[PDB]
mmCIF file of all heavy atoms in Angstrom:
data_model
loop_
_atom_site.group_PDB
_atom_site.id
_atom_site.type_symbol
_atom_site.label_atom_id
_atom_site.label_comp_id
_atom_site.label_asym_id
_atom_site.label_seq_id
_atom_site.Cartn_x
_atom_site.Cartn_y
_atom_site.Cartn_z
ATOM 1 N N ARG A 60 63.862 124.090 91.628
ATOM 2 C CA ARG A 60 63.319 124.578 90.366
ATOM 3 C C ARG A 60 63.060 123.360 89.480
ATOM 4 O O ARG A 60 63.972 122.657 89.059
ATOM 5 C CB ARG A 60 64.288 125.561 89.674
ATOM 6 C CG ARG A 60 63.729 125.990 88.301
ATOM 7 C CD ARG A 60 64.502 127.118 87.688
ATOM 8 N NE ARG A 60 65.865 126.717 87.288
ATOM 9 C CZ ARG A 60 66.590 127.309 86.340
ATOM 10 N NH1 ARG A 60 66.074 128.337 85.676
ATOM 11 N NH2 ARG A 60 67.804 126.888 86.058
ATOM 12 N N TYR A 61 61.794 123.123 89.142
ATOM 13 C CA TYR A 61 61.416 121.965 88.336
ATOM 14 C C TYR A 61 61.384 122.335 86.867
ATOM 15 O O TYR A 61 60.442 122.989 86.409
ATOM 16 C CB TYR A 61 60.037 121.429 88.765
ATOM 17 C CG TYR A 61 60.084 120.859 90.186
ATOM 18 C CD1 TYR A 61 59.785 121.656 91.292
ATOM 19 C CD2 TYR A 61 60.425 119.551 90.388
ATOM 20 C CE1 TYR A 61 59.898 121.148 92.561
ATOM 21 C CE2 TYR A 61 60.516 119.010 91.682
ATOM 22 C CZ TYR A 61 60.267 119.828 92.755
ATOM 23 O OH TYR A 61 60.433 119.331 94.036
ATOM 24 N N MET A 62 62.416 121.932 86.134
ATOM 25 C CA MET A 62 62.622 122.325 84.735
ATOM 26 C C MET A 62 61.851 121.383 83.777
ATOM 27 O O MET A 62 62.441 120.725 82.905
ATOM 28 C CB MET A 62 64.108 122.418 84.433
ATOM 29 C CG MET A 62 64.780 123.477 85.295
ATOM 30 S SD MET A 62 66.510 123.678 85.034
ATOM 31 C CE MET A 62 66.617 124.259 83.296
ATOM 32 N N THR A 63 60.539 121.333 84.001
ATOM 33 C CA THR A 63 59.645 120.482 83.215
ATOM 34 C C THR A 63 58.201 120.937 83.327
ATOM 35 O O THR A 63 57.795 121.290 84.430
ATOM 36 C CB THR A 63 59.797 118.977 83.683
ATOM 37 O OG1 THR A 63 58.715 118.177 83.123
ATOM 38 C CG2 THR A 63 59.801 118.817 85.207
ATOM 39 N N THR A 64 57.404 120.758 82.269
ATOM 40 C CA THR A 64 55.931 121.063 82.380
ATOM 41 C C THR A 64 55.186 119.949 83.131
ATOM 42 O O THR A 64 53.984 120.059 83.313
ATOM 43 C CB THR A 64 55.294 121.278 81.002
ATOM 44 O OG1 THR A 64 55.472 120.120 80.214
ATOM 45 C CG2 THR A 64 55.819 122.491 80.293
ATOM 46 N N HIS A 70 57.557 128.844 91.006
ATOM 47 C CA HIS A 70 58.897 128.997 91.584
ATOM 48 C C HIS A 70 59.157 130.376 92.213
ATOM 49 O O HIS A 70 58.543 131.381 91.845
ATOM 50 C CB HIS A 70 59.924 128.699 90.489
ATOM 51 C CG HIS A 70 59.853 127.290 90.012
ATOM 52 N ND1 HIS A 70 59.359 126.967 88.762
ATOM 53 C CD2 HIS A 70 60.046 126.133 90.688
ATOM 54 C CE1 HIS A 70 59.355 125.650 88.692
ATOM 55 N NE2 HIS A 70 59.770 125.080 89.819
ATOM 56 N N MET A 79 65.603 118.022 86.403
ATOM 57 C CA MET A 79 65.219 117.897 85.009
ATOM 58 C C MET A 79 65.360 116.444 84.618
ATOM 59 O O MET A 79 65.942 115.654 85.392
ATOM 60 C CB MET A 79 66.064 118.804 84.129
ATOM 61 C CG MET A 79 67.538 118.376 84.000
ATOM 62 S SD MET A 79 68.553 119.509 83.013
ATOM 63 C CE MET A 79 68.785 120.902 84.207
ATOM 64 N N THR A 83 66.780 115.818 78.989
ATOM 65 C CA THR A 83 66.824 117.302 78.959
ATOM 66 C C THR A 83 68.259 117.778 79.292
ATOM 67 O O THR A 83 68.764 118.700 78.646
ATOM 68 C CB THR A 83 65.833 117.849 80.010
ATOM 69 O OG1 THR A 83 64.497 117.414 79.679
ATOM 70 C CG2 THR A 83 65.896 119.419 80.095
ATOM 71 N N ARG A 87 70.347 119.963 76.602
ATOM 72 C CA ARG A 87 70.811 121.319 76.850
ATOM 73 C C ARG A 87 72.316 121.421 76.749
ATOM 74 O O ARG A 87 72.832 122.434 76.300
ATOM 75 C CB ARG A 87 70.277 121.825 78.195
ATOM 76 C CG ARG A 87 68.772 121.959 78.158
ATOM 77 C CD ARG A 87 68.116 122.294 79.497
ATOM 78 N NE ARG A 87 68.312 123.666 79.905
ATOM 79 C CZ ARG A 87 67.428 124.654 79.691
ATOM 80 N NH1 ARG A 87 66.316 124.407 79.007
ATOM 81 N NH2 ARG A 87 67.695 125.874 80.114
HETATM 82 C C1 ZW5 B 501 60.970 126.282 85.866
HETATM 83 O O1 ZW5 B 501 62.116 126.406 85.027
HETATM 84 C C2 ZW5 B 501 62.102 125.887 83.735
HETATM 85 C C3 ZW5 B 501 60.925 125.251 83.153
HETATM 86 C C4 ZW5 B 501 60.981 124.804 81.872
HETATM 87 C C5 ZW5 B 501 62.177 124.954 81.112
HETATM 88 C C6 ZW5 B 501 62.253 124.549 79.645
HETATM 89 N N1 ZW5 B 501 61.927 123.362 79.383
HETATM 90 C C7 ZW5 B 501 62.819 122.408 79.953
HETATM 91 C C8 ZW5 B 501 62.565 120.935 79.487
HETATM 92 N N2 ZW5 B 501 62.309 120.783 78.079
HETATM 93 C C9 ZW5 B 501 61.533 121.812 77.397
HETATM 94 C C10 ZW5 B 501 61.804 123.285 77.924
HETATM 95 C C11 ZW5 B 501 63.284 125.576 81.674
HETATM 96 C C12 ZW5 B 501 63.232 126.036 82.989
HETATM 97 F F1 ZW5 B 501 64.300 126.630 83.527
#
Side-chain angles (χ1 to χ4, degrees):
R60 177 171 67 157
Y61 293 92
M62 299 179 64
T63 167
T64 58
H70 297 108
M79 69 183 77
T83 300
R87 294 173 74 95

